[PDB]
């Protein structure tokens, strides 16, 4: 019983998080399905550390101080269940397993309940920050069996990104799958932000005809203002980056985006619970569309765009327009994200601290933005805040960007530039701010062909069927949603 | 053994389909969970028919000619499984159960396999056309256990809508859940169409300031050309329709769209299998957004739109623009739908006849369109057609609408009119026709923060990790999708 904690999984996240814990003075026992990788790790990256290895689960468990604490950082899915099944017979009541991978929240909820019945404390925790964050200070979103929290708080908050006054970007999120749900939403917002950034870049490149380094500079400048954020920052660096041959690397890269599930899950959750998280939807679909690379090559030969477009305006003015469009859309991204969190708390009874979640994102986090503090403030003033757009800071920002936003989109449309996210964000804003929508026509159509019934504005809750054609029956469908 | 067939479920679809079969000379045994409704039906709507009723399943089954044929038209979900469980003990090998409701295809696949093992032939069939279609001639999309097809073909094709030369809008779709899958896609396309129509109506109302009856006329006119279709037709009727007090009915209707699952399922399937069916996604979320009626009233108080917009152009010219925009977007809706069908065939091994499916939609069907014949022709010319937009008829149509399309959207944007479907449709067109997309930047970002690796254009399939920051490690994540 010499090791403070064990970690399973020796890819980018596992190796780096191990070294982080080591640097903070914790003895860590490393393990991996492919056992050869343990030795390779101890002989290289962990060469001069306190890290110890195991050749088997049995051995790994035996090295742990009680209550034993084991972290899993492996590919999400069956692998996590595989390890749990093997560990349970080796563990004692009160022992703790922490899944730090990108697992679906429903899986986490299930595992949490199963293991609790067996006396084992299960934590499902989101980890943000990628390689760098794992190595030096990640954002941690722990949820599950809170009985575990007291036994992991010290390590977790110990290694977590610290901000300003030294406050850790890691606090208990809530019960069962709450941690992984929050992490899911984190990735939804991330997907959205990345896609919007791509659309800005596409406008800079193809409407304004800017050079790679010129665009790098634009992002670098944007990073000093309201758009101050991790993603804007690295985009600037990416645009600057030169390959060993002196040419820029980005233009050499294949334009087919991968995805590993979290974005998709966010969109699916939104659909299942009826939350209009439109940006994430378009972001995921945009990745799918880019995957059709071969099709797009084919299509580019037959489908023509706007034939006669030339940008005849002030490039500098339009660049600023792009900036403001990006800012407003970024705001919608986050607002939708928080709508989804609020909906989850309602669906599952999780007591989520929205302001707190915002604070956890200030460091070691992919969606770190200068305005996360503003989000916290918003929920402080009004914990029941129904939407970020209703808070003054965000309402004002969007109001100030609105003109530029519409200008950028209209121009984009005229130029033939794909802006799935810019447009969906604006459509959402325009939809959400409208007291009357044409959805009443949808109701009329449904009642007309399917007898689904509808309600009058003047008396909501009472459903009616109308004999639209004058030749229909009286027997209608029932009024229900599904 | 006097009845030819039984049907369970006495709401709009069931009552009407029973009367349809009765008119074609088939003796039908009616049943329902709430048995009192059986007698009510025989005493009223079926008062002068050959319909017979049962007071129990046992009694209903005993009235059927072998092989026994039972149709289920009840609310999708558990209720279907409930009846199957109760029926199986009463049935003989070779008997046939037909689920005509809007069931999820995965449920249908499962039921089909389970019952096959028990000697019972299961058909899952989509039914289109609503009340009027059920009553006089529906589109029928039968799939499941093909051993049943010969035993139901006569009745099914008998009551199905007939087109032109008298060909029935009903043929065998494919194995297991294929029928219900096709039906799901049908509803996806339908949701998309309806939402597009609402957006055109919104533009007519709020940009062009047209009167109800004037807009009614516009749709009536549009229904004579390329937009000739069921939904355009009924929209014209709905706009004209006056309540008992002489005022138009539509403006009295509450602005909150319901949904019963199929649209949502389509979008989810699309996400799960990586097909960019963007229109259905926006259509479903638009309904969700409309449901936030109370929130929208609140938001309309705080969130301002474009302050200084006045339409200063030719109304007639812009009305035509809207028409062309609608047409192009409608085309995208169907194109996306068939991409999903193609994907399903691949995923599940279903041998789907795309042209045949288009033909089934020509009558008694909510998405009846004048150009369904064109879709059939396209797949005739090229059964491997990867996308409708690649066919000359559709390529040309979109090419001719393109200008008006962008004009409509750009104007809509400036006026502050929500166009989630118009804009997603156009974004998708612009994305799909582009050989190069900014997705390369997403790949760069992913590799930069998460070491997800990427490929070079010049050598696809070989994944690389780059040390973007110059201070990172060599251990990356693995390259995989999920
Ligand atoms: N309405 C349309 O235009 C449309 C078009 C095509 C297909 N469909 C599908 O066809 C099916 C029938 O649609 P519909 O609109 O006619 O009726 P519905 O409103 O969807 O369902 C009402 C029928 O389902 C029965 N039912 C509800 N819950 C039940 C339960 N728990 N156990 C047993 N029976 C139950 C009701 O029986 P009780 O009388 O005892 O309550 C009634 O007979 C549905 O699956 C629908 O999705 C609908
Ligand atoms: N990469 C990131 O920037 C990022 C950021 C935050 C969180 N995460 C999440 O954290 C976890 C680790 O991510 P990662 O990128 O470091 O690695 P990864 O590529 O997602 O997974 C590789 C690790 O999982 C193990 N593994 C794969 N399949 C397995 C199976 N069937 N049974 C047992 N182990 C299996 C591998 O073991 P072997 O060596 O034996 O093959 C290896 O240790 C993932 O769940 C990921 O979603 C990733
Ligand atoms: Cl991640
Ligand atoms: Cl605490
Ligand atoms: Cl050609
Ligand atoms: Cl339907
Ligand atoms: Cl045949
Ligand atoms: Cl106010």
List the helices and strands and how they pair.
The structure is a homodimer of 482-residue chains.
Chain A: E1 5-8, H1 12-23, E2 28-31, H2 36-43, E3 52-53, H3 57-62, E4 69-72, H4 78-87, E5 96-99, H5 105-117, E6 121-128, H6 130-136, E7 139-144, H7 149-159, E8 162-163, E9 167-168, E10 174-175, H8 178-206, H9 212-222, H10 230-240, H11 262-273, H12 278-291, H13 293-302, H14 315-348, H15 354-360, H16 372-381, H17 392-415, H18 420-432, H19 439-450, E11 454-456, E12 459-464
Parallel strand pairs in A: 1-2, 1-4, 2-3, 4-5, 5-6, 7-10
Antiparallel strand pairs in A: 6-7, 8-9, 11-12
The complex binds NADP nicotinamide-adenine-dinucleotide phosphate (2 copies) and chloride ion (6 copies).
Family (chains A, B): Belongs to the 6-phosphogluconate dehydrogenase family.
Main location (chains A, B): cytoplasm
Binding site for NADP(+) (chains A, B): 9-14, 32-34, 74-76, 102, 477-480
